[PDB]
Amino acid sequence: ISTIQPKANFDAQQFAGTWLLVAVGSACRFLQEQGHRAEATTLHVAPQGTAMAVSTFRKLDGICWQVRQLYGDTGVLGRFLLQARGAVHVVVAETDYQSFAVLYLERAGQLSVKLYARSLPVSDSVLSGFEQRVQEAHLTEDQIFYFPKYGFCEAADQFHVLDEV
């Protein structure tokens, strides 16, 4: 169990829009055995009160799917909660409002990092900072996995949607 300082004065309104997941550094079974089958993962952020409405588009067997979740607030600005065995703690520590975004997730005493960007390509300095942070997070370089830079879903359908909320 670890906890760091989130982004100072995080604004969900200025953070809204379409985000694109680039790299995720962690030690998970799907990341190490099925990491070669990863695809383009995009994110959609929509503010809802203190919480954050979250939509995720990703190609599963070619057909796109919509993952709708609601990151419940933990009472502290910057930190969020998500529920399904396990508790997810979303922590945003270092990000701007125009080019990149870094997220921290915790589950079952395991830490994980996520790199989000508004568009491709990603700046080399952002990737260097992400590598430095994932190395400071007691994670090795081999646990870093890059994602394709194309094939992002435009929009899903009523049938292809997730209903965690």
Residues that bind another protein (CB under 8 A): 21, 24, 26, 28-31, 33-34, 38, 41, 58, 60-63, 65, 67, 69, 82, 86, 88, 105-107, 110, 112, 158-159, 162, 164
Nearest distance in Å: CB 157, another protein: 9
Q: Where are the alpha helices (DSSP H) in the chain?
A: 12-15, 29-33, 124-136
38 or 77, CB closer to another protein?
38
CB of 94 to another protein, least distance (A): 19
DSSP string computed for 37-71: G---EEEEEEEETTEEEEEEEEEETTEEEEEEEEE
Residue type, position 129, single letter: G
In terms of CB distance, is 69 or 79 closer to another protein?
Answer: 69
> Closest separation between CB of residue 122 and another protein, Å?
16
Nearer Cβ to another protein (94/106): 106
Q: Which is nearer to another protein, 6 or 69 (CB)?
A: 69
Nearest-approach distance from CB 159 to another protein, in angstroms = 5
What's the burial of 33, exposed, middle or buried (CB within 10 Å: 0-12/13-18/19+)?
A: exposed
Amino acid at 121: P
Q: By the 8 A CB rule, do 74 and 80 touch?
A: yes
